[PDB]
Design an enzyme around this catalytic site. Structure first.
Site, PDB file in Angstrom:
ATOM      1  N   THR A 120      -6.848   1.343   0.055  1.00 54.13           N
ATOM      2  CA  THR A 120      -6.488  -0.070   0.100  1.00 54.13           C
ATOM      3  C   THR A 120      -7.310  -0.805   1.145  1.00 54.13           C
ATOM      4  OG1 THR A 120      -4.246   0.485  -0.601  1.00 54.13           O
ATOM      5  CG2 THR A 120      -4.578  -1.671   0.434  1.00 54.13           C
ATOM      6  N   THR A 121      -7.530  -0.171   2.297  1.00 59.51           N
ATOM      7  CA  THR A 121      -8.312  -0.798   3.352  1.00 59.51           C
ATOM      8  C   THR A 121      -9.763  -0.992   2.927  1.00 59.51           C
ATOM      9  OG1 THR A 121      -8.926  -0.592   5.685  1.00 59.51           O
ATOM     10  CG2 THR A 121      -8.792   1.435   4.391  1.00 59.51           C
ATOM     11  N   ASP A 162       1.142   7.544   0.917  1.00 59.19           N
ATOM     12  CA  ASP A 162      -0.281   7.767   0.718  1.00 59.19           C
ATOM     13  C   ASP A 162      -0.549   9.165   0.179  1.00 59.19           C
ATOM     14  OD1 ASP A 162      -0.244   5.309   1.806  1.00 59.19           O
ATOM     15  OD2 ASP A 162      -1.072   5.896   3.762  1.00 59.19           O
ATOM     16  N   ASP A 215      -3.235  -0.130   6.405  1.00 53.75           N
ATOM     17  CA  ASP A 215      -3.925  -0.366   5.140  1.00 53.75           C
ATOM     18  C   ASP A 215      -4.374  -1.809   4.990  1.00 53.75           C
ATOM     19  OD1 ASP A 215      -3.580   2.268   4.362  1.00 53.75           O
ATOM     20  OD2 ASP A 215      -1.820   1.860   3.115  1.00 53.75           O
TER      21      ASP A 215
END
Lengths: 509, 67, 508, 102, 517
Positions: free
Chosen positions: E82-83, E380, E49
Site C-alpha cells: 500500500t505504501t 498484512d 502504510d
C-alpha cells in the site's frame, strides 16, 4: 488534515519539546530556578514550582512531543518515582543534539542506531556505575537515607521532610529485602504539627471508636468482614419489600432484625473482640458487638482493611459468607490513641514484621498534600532499591562517565552511527551543565573539569551545585540510586529517537 | 470635574454649614494656597515642608485676628 | 533562555518596583495619602499601602505578590505593613543591579536570606527588650507605640482594655505570641467606647428563645449541627404532595419527629443551645423550636458556624450534630448566660464565667454610634497588634527608619568582611536599607541624602544616638521623642520581600 | 387532549384547602392564643381525626403548635404540586394540540 | 462555471502527487520513519502504510481523494505494498509531468506505461519463485511473519502470532479452496494479557457469564447450545422487577428459577451441550443459581455474538425458547471456559470442529495501543498468505525487483520506441526510485544505493540479493528475507499505473463551477 512532513514536524517537534524541555530544566534540582505557573483561562493564578509535572497540566500544549512527553514526564514520575523533570529535558537534551544533526541533514535512521546503541555504552557505564548499596545494614540505612531525601529534595519540600524521611526509611527499613507498600500503612492526615508524624509499628485504623465500642483490645482478634447490617450482604436471611395488604409493614422489618442479631452471633461465633467491617455496623449489631466486648468498626479503612488483614494476619470474610472460615487478624494491642488532632486506633504487634503505619502530620493541608506524593516516589525508589540495593554516582559523576564511555564509543564505532553517539554522549554531559546552570556557576569549567575528572575517569566525584564546586560521589549524599538514574536514562532515550520516528505528522484539527 | 473640585465645594459647603460667608472665599483662598506652594513643591520644596510654615502661619494670622 | 524569564523577571521587576514607590509616597503618616479611582470611578484617599495594594490593583503577578507582602505583614504583626512594601523595591532595585551585574538570581537569592539572618541580629543588637511578663511595661510600651502611632484617643482608653484583654490572654511571662485567636472582638450598636468592655465569656450575637429561659446560670451550651426539621420528602415537609388526607397522617409524622429530636435535646439536656443559621442548616423546624424553647431551654439561633468554631474552641462548646453529642460533653458550661440589651441599642448574649479552654476573652465594642464603634476597633487592634508585635517578638526598637540607617552601613562592611562575589550582593543587600528612611525623610521632608548621611554617621557613632523622629522627622534621638516599634514589625517585614524576591529571582 | 388539565386539577385541588389553611393559619396563631388562655376551665379536647378524645392542656397546647404544622405542611407541599403539575401541564399543551391540528 | 487547464489541473494533480508519495519515502519500511496522525480531535496517532494514514489524513485534491480509493485494494488482497503505489504513482507521474512538460501527450506515453506494466509485470513474472507449499511457505511466512511482527507493534517477532496467524489462514486457507477471508479468520483483540499472550481459536471466545464462581463453573462436551432464548429464566438485558406476595413466596420464586433452570437445562441439553449462550442477560440471582443448579449459561450477550457463534457454527440460533433445534444450537468441536486475561473471568472458548467456517486468532495486549498495533500488524502477513494460498508465488523485491523490472523496461524503451520509449524509460526510473527512496528513508545515499544494485543488476538479474530494507550491511532479498507475493508487487504494479492512467480518464476538465466545490 495537515500533513506535516519532517520539515514542519521537526521545528514544531523541537519548539515545544525543546523550549518546554527548557521549562522543566528551568526548575531543576535544588538550585532549579522556579517558573511562575501561568494559570491560563483561569485567573492569572500564580503558581511557583520546581516540578514540571505541574507545568504539564497548567498551560495546555498542542506540541505533539510536548503532548507526548507529558506522559514521558509522568511515566518516570509515576513509576520510577523521582526523575520526573530528569527524564523530561533529557529528551530535550537530545533533540537539540538532533537539531544540528538533522541540520547536518542526518537521517534519524543515521541518528537512532547511534544514540540507541550508545545507550548501552552509557548503560554499561551506568551498569558499571551501578554500585550495590544496601548490601550492608549501615549501607542500607545510608542507602535508605541517601535515596529518600534525594527523591523529595528537588520535589519542592525539604523542610520537615527530614522527619518524614527517617520514618519512611524506618518503615522501608523493615521491608528487609522485600519491598512491601502494604506492609507499611500510609496515614496522610492534616493535624498535629509540621512534624507530629508518627510511624506506628503495626496497622492503624484512624477511626474514633471512643469508649462506646471497645477502644482497647488485648490479644486482639481482628475479624475482617464485609458484613452489611442494613445493606445486608449475602448470607442474607431476610425477606424484601412487598405489600400484599395494609398490614404488610410488619413482616419486612422483623426479617432483617433477626439476621443482624444472627450475624452478630456469627461475629460472636469466632471469639473475636474486634469486628472490622468494611461496611456499616448498624445500631442493633453494634450494641450486640459492644455486648460481647467485640470492637465494632464500621466502614474501616478501605485500603486499610486488607492492609490490616495483611499486616495483622487476617483474611476477608468474603462479603461475610463465613460463619467461621474467615481468618482473623491478630495484633498485640488495639488501642485508640490520639495522634495529631484525632483519636487513631493503633493496632500494634500486627502479624507482619515488615509492617508499619506511618502517620503524616501537616500544619496545613497545603503542607500535608505535597509531601506524600513526593514521599511516595522515594519509597518506590527505595522499594526499587530494596530490590536492587544500589546507587549510581550522580551530579554528573556517572553522566560524564557514561558520556565518556559513550564518547569512547563515539571514538570507537564512529561511522554515521557514532556521528550520533557523539551528540548522544554530549547530552549526558549537558545535564551536568544544567545543574550548575540552575546554580549559576561555570558549566564550561566544572563539566570539562568533571570531564577532566572523567576523561581519565573519576568514579568518585561529581559537580556539587549545593557547594557550587566539584564534590565526591562515594555516596557523599548526592550519589543517587541506580534505580532512577538508569530509568531516567531509559525513557527519554526512547522518546527522542521516537520523536525522530515521526517525520510524517498529519494534523486534522 | 474633579474630586479636588468636589471636596472644595464640600469645604465651602462645610464653611456654608457654619456660615455662607467665606465659602466663596475659602475656595478662592485654597486656589491661592495651592498655587503658592505648588511652585515651591515644584521647585525644591517638599509638600510636607511647605504646609508647616503655612498652617503654623494660619496659627499666626489668627493670633493677630485674635489680637 | 532564562533571559526571557529574566526579561519576565525584569518585567515582573518592572511592574513590582514602580508599585512599591507608590507606597513610598504613603510611607509613614508624614508620607502622603494617595487618591484612588475605583470601578466606582470615585476618589479613594488613604495613606494605607495595604489597601492601596488591595483596593485598586493590577493582577500582574509581581503586583499579586505585593499585596501578600503587606498582607503577611498585615497578619504577621498586624502592623508595619507600609514598611514591608517600602523594603520591597529597595532590593528589587539592587537585585536588578546584580542581574545587570549578571549575578545569578539564585546567587542573588542565595546571598540574601543568608545575609538577612545577619542583619536581624545587628537589628536586634540595636533593640531594647521590654518586659512581656509585666502588663504595665507593655501597657507603657505598646501605648508608647500607640503614642508612636496616630490612633491614641480610644487606644489610650483601649490600651488597658487591649493590654488587659491581652494580659488575660497572657498566661506566659513570655506572653507567647498573644494570638488574637483567643480574642473575640464584638461590637454592640449602643453604648459608647467607654461601654466597650472586656468580657471573660463569649459575648454572643443576640439570643433566640420562644418560651426559653431568658438567662440561665451554669449554662450548658448546646449546639445544633443536626436538622430539627422533619426530613424533606416533598418541599420541607415529611409529607408528600398529593391530597389532603394521606399527608395529614404524615403531617402527624412531621409533628412528632421534630418534637422528639427536640425532646431528645433536653433529654440529654442543655441550658443553652447554640443554633447556627437555618441556612447554615438544611432546615430547622420552628414548631420543634416552638416546643424546644417551650421545653424552657435558653437558646441562641442563627450564629456563624465559623464563630461557632471560635465558640467551640474558646468557651469549649464543641460541635454537636447529635442528641448524644449533648451530654455535658461538647457543652460548654457557662456560669452566667444572658443577653444584654442595655446601653442604647444592640442585644448580645454575654457569657459571664464559663468552662472554657485557655482564658476566653471577648471584648464588647460599644460606641456613640456605628462610626464611634468603628473607630475604637483599630484602637484595640492597633494596640492589640503592637502588643502581639512585642509580646511575640520581645525586643523593642525605635521606629523612624533609623535602624535601617544603622544596619545598612554595617551590613555593607559585613558584606565586605563576608567578601566573596556575594559581597556585592550583600553590599547591594545592605544598600536597600536607607531607601526606606530616605523616602521617609522626604515624607517628613528633608534631604535624606543629606540627612541619612549623618544619622548614618550617628548610627556609625552611637549606633543610635539619633534617628529620623517622626514629628521632627529628622536627626534626633527617636528614643527621646519615643517613636518606638517592636522588632516584629521590623523583622516580620524583612523575610517577606527578600523571600518574595528570593522567590521571584528563582521564578522564571 | 387528556394531558392538559390532569395536572391543573390537583393544582387547583391542593391550592384551595391550602388557602383554607390561611384562614386556619390566623386561627392556628389564634388557637395558640385561645388555648393558652385556657387553663383547663373548659374541657380541652384535641379535634385531631374523627375520634374526639378526653385530652389534657399540654395535649391541647402541643397539638396546636402541631396544628400549625397543618398550615406549615399543607401550604408548603403544594407550592411543589403547584409547579410540579403546572409545568408538566404547560408542557403537554402545545405538543398534543399542534399534532391534532397539523 | 470555472474551467481550468488540464495542465493547471495536472499541476494540482502533481502538486497533490508529491507529499503523499513523499509521505512514504522516508516512511518506507522500518528504515522508514513513523507517520503521525493528529486528529480533528487533536489526537496524536502513529500510523502506517497508506490506507491507515491516507484515510486518517483528510484527502483534498482529486488525487488525494482518488488515492485512498485505489490504495485500499492493495492492503485488501495483499496486505502490503500500500505504501508503494503512492510513491510509485507520483514518481512516474511527476516525470510524466516532466514528460508532458517536454510537450508530451499524457495520451500517448500512458499506454506505454500500461504496456510497460505488463513487460515489467512479465519481467516480474520471471522474478524469484513460482511456488510455496504448506510447510515451505511457513519459513517464507516466518520470513514475513518475522518482518510483520518484526515491524509495527514489536520488532521482536513473537513466533506466537507469526505461526498463529498463518495457522488460522492455513486452517481456513484450504477451507475456501486455497482461499481465505479475514472474517473467515479473525484477529480477536481483547486485553488482560500482553502481546505475548495470544491465541488461535477455531471459533468464538466470549467471557463466560458467571454471577458467582462457587456456584459451579461448568463447561463440557464439545458443543455449545446457541440460544437467542433462555437457558435460565430470560431478561432483555435491562431492569426487571422481582416481587413476591408474602415472606415465604421469595423461596417459591427461586424454585421457579430452579425448575426452569433444569426445565431449560433438560430442554436445551437434550438438543446438545448444556452450554447455552443466552442473549438475555439476567439478574445476579438465577444466573448463579443456575450456575449452582447445574451447567452455567452465558447471559448478557451481544445479539451479534449469539449470531456470530451461530454463523461460526454454520447452524442457526434458537430464536424462541418454545422452539429448539440442534442446528439452531452450536456446531462446536470444542467449548471450554478458559481463563481469560490475567485480569478477569474465564473466557468461554468455542472452537468449532463440528462446523467452523471461521477460525480466529485471538490476541491479548499489554495496552490497547500495542494490541491494536499488533492487530494493525497482523492483517498484512494475513493477507500475503491469502495471496499465497490462492497463488503461492512470491517475488524478491524492494531493490531486487524494481531496478530489475525497470532495467528490462529501460531496455524495452529502446526496443519499442516512440511514445512508449520515453514511457518505458520513465516507466522504469520510477521503480528504481523505491529502493533508492529506501536509502532515502534509510541512512544511505539513495543514489549510490540504486547505483549499487544497479551494478549488481548489471552483474546479476533478479538477484536473491537486493538493497537492505533492514539496513543490514549485507544488501540482500533472500537474506533480508524481504519478499512479496508476486501477486502483490504485480497487483502493486497495477495500481499506480492504474491511477496515473485514471488521472487521464477521458476529457472533461470543466465543472459547473463545482469540481472540488
Amino acid at each position: 488534515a495537515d500533513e506535516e512532513r519532517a520539515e514542519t514536524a521537526r521545528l514544531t517537534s523541537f519548539i515545544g519539546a525543546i523550549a518546554i524541555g527548557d521549562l522543566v530544566k528551568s526548575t531543576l534540582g535544588p538550585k532549579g530556578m522556579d517558573k511562575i505557573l501561568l494559570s491560563s483561562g483561569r485567573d492569572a493564578s500564580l503558581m511557583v514550582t520546581n516540578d514540571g509535572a505541574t507545568i504539564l497540566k497548567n498551560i495546555g500544549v498542542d506540541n505533539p512531543a510536548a503532548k507526548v512527553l507529558v506522559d514521558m514526564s509522568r511515566v518516570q514520575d509515576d513509576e520510577v518515582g523521582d526523575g520526573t523533570t530528569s527524564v523530561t529535558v533529557l529528551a530535550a537534551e537530545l533533540l537539540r543534539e538532533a537539531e544540528s544533526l538533522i541540520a547536518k541533514k542526518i537521517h534519524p535512521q543515521t541518528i537512532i542506531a547511534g544514540w540507541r546503541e550508545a545507550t548501552k555504552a552509557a548503560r554499561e557505564a551506568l551498569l558499571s556505575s551501578a554500585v550495590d548499596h544496601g548490601s550492608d545494614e549501615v549501607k542500607f540505612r545510608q542507602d535508605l537515607m541517601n535515596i529518600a531525601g534525594t527523591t523529595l529534595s528537588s520535589k519542592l519540600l525539604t523542610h520537615h521532610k527530614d522527619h518524614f524521611t527517617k520514618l519512611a526509611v524506618e518503615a522501608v527499613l523493615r521491608l528487609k529485602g522485600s519491598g512491601n507498600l502494604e506492609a507499611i500503612h500510609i496515614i496522610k492526615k492534616l493535624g498535629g504539627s509540621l512534624a507530629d508524624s508518627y510511624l506506628d509499628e503495626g496497622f492503624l485504623l484512624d477511626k474514633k471508636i471512643g469508649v462506646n465500642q471497645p477502644k482497647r483490645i488485648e490479644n486482639a482478634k481482628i475479624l475482617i468482614a464485609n458484613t452489611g447490617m442494613d445493606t445486608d450482604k449475602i448470607k442474607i436471611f431476610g425477606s424484601r419489600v412487598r405489600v400484599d395488604s395494609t398490614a404488610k409493614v410488619a413482616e419486612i422489618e422483623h426479617a432483617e432484625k433477626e439476621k443482624m442479631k444472627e450475624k452478630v452471633e456469627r461475629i460472636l461465633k469466632h471469639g473475636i473482640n474486634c469486628f472490622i467491617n468494611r461496611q456499616l455496623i448498624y445500631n442493633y449489631p453494634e450494641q450486640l458487638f459492644g455486648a460481647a466486648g467485640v470492637m465494632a468498626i464500621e466502614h474501616a479503612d478501605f485500603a486499610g482493611v486488607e492492609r490490616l488483614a495483611l499486616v495483622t494476619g487476617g483474611e476477608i470474610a468474603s462479603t461475610f459468607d463465613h460463619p467461621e472460615l474467615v481468618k482473623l487478624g491478630s495484633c498485640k494491642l488495639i488501642e485508640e490513641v490520639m495522634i495529631g488532632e484525632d483519636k487513631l486506633i493503633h493496632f500494634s504487634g500486627v502479624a507482619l514484621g515488615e509492617a508499619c503505619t506511618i502517620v503524616l502530620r501537616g500544619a496545613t493541608q497545603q503542607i500535608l498534600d505535597e509531601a506524600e506524593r513526593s514521599l511516595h516516589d522515594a519509597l518506590c525508589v527505595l522499594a526499587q532499591t530494596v530490590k536492587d540495593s544500589r546507587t549510581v554516582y550522580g551530579g554528573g559523576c556517572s553522566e560524564m562517565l557514561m558520556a565518556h564511555a559513550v564518547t569512547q564509543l563515539a571514538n570507537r564505532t564512529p561511522g554515521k552511527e557514532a556521528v550520533a553517539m557523539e551528540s548522544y554522549a554530549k547530552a549526558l554531559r549537558m545535564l551536568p551543565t544544567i545543574i550548575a546552570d540552575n546554580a549559576g556557576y561555570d558549566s564550561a569549567d566544572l563539566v570539562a573539569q568533571l570531564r577532566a575528572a572523567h576523561s581519565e575517569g573519576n568514579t568518585t566525584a561529581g559537580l556539587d551545585m549545593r557547594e557550587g564546586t566539584i564534590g565526591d560521589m562515594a555516596i557523599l549524599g548526592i550519589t543517587e540510586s541506580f534505580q532512577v538514574k538508569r530509568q531516567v536514562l531509559l525513557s527519554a532515550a526512547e522518546a527522542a529517537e521516537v520523536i525522530l520516528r515521526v517525520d510524517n505528522i498529519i494534523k486534522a484539527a | 470635574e474633579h474630586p479636588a473640585a468636589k471636596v472644595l465645594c464640600e469645604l465651602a459647603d462645610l464653611q456654608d454649614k457654619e456660615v455662607g460667608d467665606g465659602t466663596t472665599s475659602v475656595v478662592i483662598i485654597a486656589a491661592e494656597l495651592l498655587k503658592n506652594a505648588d511652585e515651591l513643591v515644584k521647585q525644591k520644596i517638599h509638600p510636607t515642608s511647605v504646609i508647616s510654615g503655612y498652617r503654623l502661619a494660619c496659627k499666626e494670622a489668627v493670633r493677630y485676628i485674635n489680637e | 533562555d532564562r533571559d526571557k524569564p529574566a526579561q519576565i523577571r525584569f518585567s515582573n521587576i518592572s511592574a513590582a518596583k514602580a508599585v512599591a514607590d507608590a507606597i513610598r509616597t504613603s510611607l509613614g503618616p508624614k508620607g502622603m495619602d494617595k487618591m484612588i479611582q475605583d470601578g466606582k470611578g470615585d476618589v479613594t484617599i488613604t495613606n494605607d499601602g495595604a489597601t492601596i495594594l488591595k483596593q485598586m490593583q493590577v493582577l500582574h503577578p509581581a503586583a499579586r505578590m505585593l499585596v501578600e507582602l503587606s498582607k503577611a505583614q498585615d497578619i504577621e504583626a498586624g502592623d508595619g505593613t507600609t514598611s514591608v512594601v517600602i523594603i520591597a523595591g529597595s532590593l528589587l532595585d539592587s537585585c536588578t543591579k546584580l542581574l545587570q551585574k549578571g549575578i545569578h538570581p539564585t546567587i542573588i537569592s542565595e546571598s540574601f536570606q543568608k545575609a538577612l539572618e545577619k542583619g536581624i541580629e545587628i537589628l536586634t543588637d540595636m533593640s531594647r527588650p521590654v518586659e512581656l511578663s509585666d502588663r504595665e511595661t507593655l501597657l507603657n510600651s505598646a501605648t508608647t507605640s500607640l503614642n508612636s502611632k496616630v490612633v491614641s484617643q480610644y487606644s489610650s482608653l483601649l490600651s488597658p482594655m487591649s493590654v488587659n484583654a491581652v494580659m488575660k490572654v497572657i498566661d506566659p511571662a513570655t506572653a507567647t505570641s498573644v494570638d488574637l485567636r483567643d480574642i473575640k472582638i464584638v461590637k454592640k450598636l449602643g453604648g459608647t467606647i467607654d461601654d466597650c468592655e472586656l468580657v471573660e465569656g463569649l459575648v454572643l450575637t443576640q439570643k433566640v428563645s420562644n418560651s426559653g429561659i431568658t438567662r440561665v446560670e451554669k449554662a450548658k451550651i448546646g449546639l445544633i449541627q443536626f436538622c430539627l426539621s422533619a426530613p424533606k420528602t416533598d418541599m420541607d415537609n415529611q409529607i408528600v404532595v398529593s391530597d389532603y388526607a394521606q399527608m395529614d397522617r404524615v403531617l402527624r409524622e412531621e409533628r412528632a419527629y421534630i418534637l422528639n429530636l427536640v425532646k431528645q435535646i433536653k433529654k440529654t439536656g442543655c441550658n443553652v443551645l447554640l443554633i447556627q443559621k437555618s441556612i447554615l442548616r438544611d432546615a430547622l423546624s420552628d414548631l420543634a423550636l416552638h416546643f424546644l424553647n417551650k421545653m424552657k431551654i435558653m437558646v441562641i439561633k442563627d450564629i456563624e458556624r465559623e464563630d461557632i468554631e471560635f465558640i467551640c474552641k474558646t468557651i469549649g462548646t464543641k460541635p454537636v450534630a447529635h442528641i448524644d453529642q449533648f451530654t455535658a460533653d461538647m457543652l460548654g458550661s457557662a456560669e452566667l448566660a444572658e443577653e444584654v440589651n442595655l446601653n442604647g441599642s444592640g442585644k448580645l448574649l454575654k457569657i459571664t464565667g464559663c468552662a472554657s479552654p485557655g482564658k476566653t476573652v471577648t471584648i464588647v465594642v460599644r460606641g456613640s454610634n456605628k462610626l464611634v464603634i468603628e473607630e475604637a476597633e483599630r484602637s484595640i487592634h492597633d494596640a492589640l497588634c503592637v502588643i502581639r508585635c512585642l509580646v511575640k517578638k520581645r525586643a523593642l526598637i525605635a521606629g523612624g527608619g533609623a535602624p535601617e540607617i544603622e544596619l545598612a552601613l554595617r551590613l555593607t562592611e559585613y558584606s565586605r568582611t563576608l567578601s566573596g562575589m556575594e559581597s556585592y550582593c550583600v553590599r547591594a543587600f545592605a544598600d536597600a536599607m536607607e531607601v526606606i528612611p530616605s523616602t521617609l525623610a522626604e515624607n517628613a521632608g528633608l534631604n535624606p541624602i543629606s540627612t541619612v548621611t549623618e544619622l548614618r554617621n550617628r548610627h556609625a557613632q552611637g549606633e543610635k544616638t539619633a534617628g529620623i523622629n517622626v514629628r521632627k522627622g529628622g536627626i534626633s534621638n527617636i528614643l527621646e521623642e519615643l517613636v518606638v516599634q517592636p522588632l516584629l514589625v521590623s523583622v516580620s517585614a524583612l523575610t517577606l520581600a527578600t523571600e518574595t524576591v528570593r522567590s521571584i529571582l528563582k521564578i522564571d | 387532549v387528556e394531558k392538559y388539565q390532569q395536572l391543573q386539577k390537583d393544582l387547583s385541588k391542593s391550592m384551595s384547602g391550602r388557602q383554607k389553611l390561611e384562614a386556619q393559619l390566623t386561627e392556628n396563631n389564634i388557637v395558640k392564643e385561645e388555648l393558652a388562655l385556657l387553663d383547663g376551665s373548659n374541657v380541652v379536647f384535641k379535634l385531631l381525626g374523627p375520634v374526639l378524645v378526653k385530652q389534657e392542656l399540654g395535649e391541647a397546647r402541643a397539638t396546636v403548635g402541631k396544628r400549625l404544622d397543618y398550615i406549615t405542611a399543607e401550604i408548603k407541599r403544594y407550592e411543589s404540586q403547584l409547579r410540579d403539575l403546572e409545568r408538566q401541564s404547560e408542557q403537554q399543551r402545545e405538543t398534543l394540540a399542534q399534532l391534532q391540528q397539523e | 462555471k470555472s474551467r481550468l487547464m488540464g495542465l493547471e489541473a495536472l499541476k494540482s494533480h502533481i502538486m497533490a502527487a508529491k507529499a503523499v508519495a513523499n509521505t512514504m519515502r522516508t516512511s518506507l519500511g522500518p528504515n522508514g520513519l513513523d507517520k503521525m496522525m493528529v486528529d480533528k480531535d487533536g489526537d496524536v496517532t502513529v500510523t502506517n502504510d497508506g490506507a491507515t494514514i491516507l484515510s486518517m489524513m483528510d484527502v483534498d485534491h482529486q488525487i488525494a481523494k482518488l488515492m485512498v480509493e485505489l490504495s485500499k485494494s492493495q492492503d485488501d488482497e495483499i496486505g502490503d505494498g500500500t505504501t508503494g503505489v503512492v510513491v510509485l504513482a507520483g514518481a512516474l507521474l511527476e516525470e510524466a509531468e516532466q514528460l508532458l512538460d517536454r510537450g508530451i501527450h499524457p495520451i500517448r506515453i500512458a499506454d506505454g506505461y500500461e504496456q510497460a506494466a505488463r513487460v515489467a509485470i512479465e519481467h516480474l513474472d520471471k522474478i524469484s519463485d513460482s511456488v510455496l507449499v504448506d510447510i515451505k511457505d511457513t519459513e517464507p511466512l516466518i520470513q514475513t511473519a518475522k518482518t510483520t511482527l518484526g515491524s509495527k507493534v514489536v520488532n521482536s517477532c513473537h513466533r506466537q502470532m507469526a505461526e498463529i496467524a498463518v495457522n488460522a489462514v492455513l486452517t481456513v486457507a484450504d477451507m475456501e479452496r486455497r482461499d481465505v477471508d479475514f472474517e473467515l479468520i479473525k484477529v480477536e483483540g481483547k486485553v488482560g494479557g500482553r502481546l505475548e499472550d495470544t491465541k488461535l481459536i477455531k471459533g468464538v471466545i466470549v467471557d463466560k457469564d458467571f454471577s458467582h464462581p462457587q456456584m459451579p463453573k461448568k463447561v463440557e462436551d464439545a458443543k455449545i447450545a446457541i440460544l437467542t432464548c433462555p437457558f435460565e429464566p430470560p431478561k432483555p438485558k435491562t431492569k426487571h422487577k422481582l416481587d413476591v406476595t408474602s415472606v415465604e413466596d421469595y423461596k417459591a420464586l427461586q424454585k421457579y428459577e430452579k425448575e426452569k433452570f433444569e426445565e431449560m437445562i433438560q430442554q436445551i441439553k437434550e438438543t446438545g451441550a448444556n452450554l447455552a449462550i443466552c442473549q438475555w442477560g439476567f439478574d445476579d440471582e438465577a444466573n448463579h443459581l443456575l450456575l449452582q443448579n447445574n451447567l452455567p449459561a452465558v447471559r448478557w450477550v451481544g445479539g451479534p455474538e449469539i449470531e456470530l457463534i451461530a454463523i461460526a457454527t454454520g447452524g442457526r440460533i434458537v430464536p424462541r425458547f418454545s422452539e429448539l433445534t440442534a442446528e439452531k444450537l452450536g456446531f462446536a468441536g470444542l467449548v471450554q471456559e478458559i481463563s481469560f486475561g490475567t485480569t478477569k473471568d474465564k473466557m468461554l472458548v468455542i472452537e468449532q470442529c463440528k462446523n467452523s467456517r471461521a477460525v480466529t486468532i485471538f490476541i491479548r495486549g499489554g495496552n490497547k495501543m500495542i494490541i491494536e498495533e499488533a492487530k494493525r500488524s497482523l492483517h498484512d502477513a494475513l493477507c500475503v498468505i491469502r495471496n499465497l494460498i490462492r497463488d503461492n508465488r512470491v517475488v524478491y523485491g524492494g531493490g531486487a525487483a524494481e531496478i530489475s523490472c525497470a532495467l528490462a523496461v529501460s531496455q524495452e524503451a529502446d526496443k519499442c520506441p516512440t511514445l512508449e520509449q520515453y514511457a518505458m524509460r520513465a516507466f522504469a526510473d520510477a521503480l528504481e526510485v523505491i529502493p533508492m527512496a529506501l536509502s532515502e528513508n534509510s541512512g544511505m545515499n539513495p543514489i549510490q544505493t540504486m547505483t549499487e544494485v544497479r551494478a549488481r543488476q548489471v552483474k546479476e538479474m533478479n538477484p536473491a540479493l537486493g538493497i537492505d530494507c533492514l539496513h543490514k550491511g549485507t544488501n540482500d532479498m533472500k537474506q533480508q528475507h524481504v519478499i512479496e507475493t508476486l501477486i502483490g508487487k504485480k497487483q502493486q504494479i497495477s495500481l499506480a499505473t492504474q491511477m496515473v492512467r485514471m488521472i487521464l480518464k477521458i476529457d472533461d476538465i470543466r465543472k459547473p463551477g463545482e469540481s472540488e466545490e
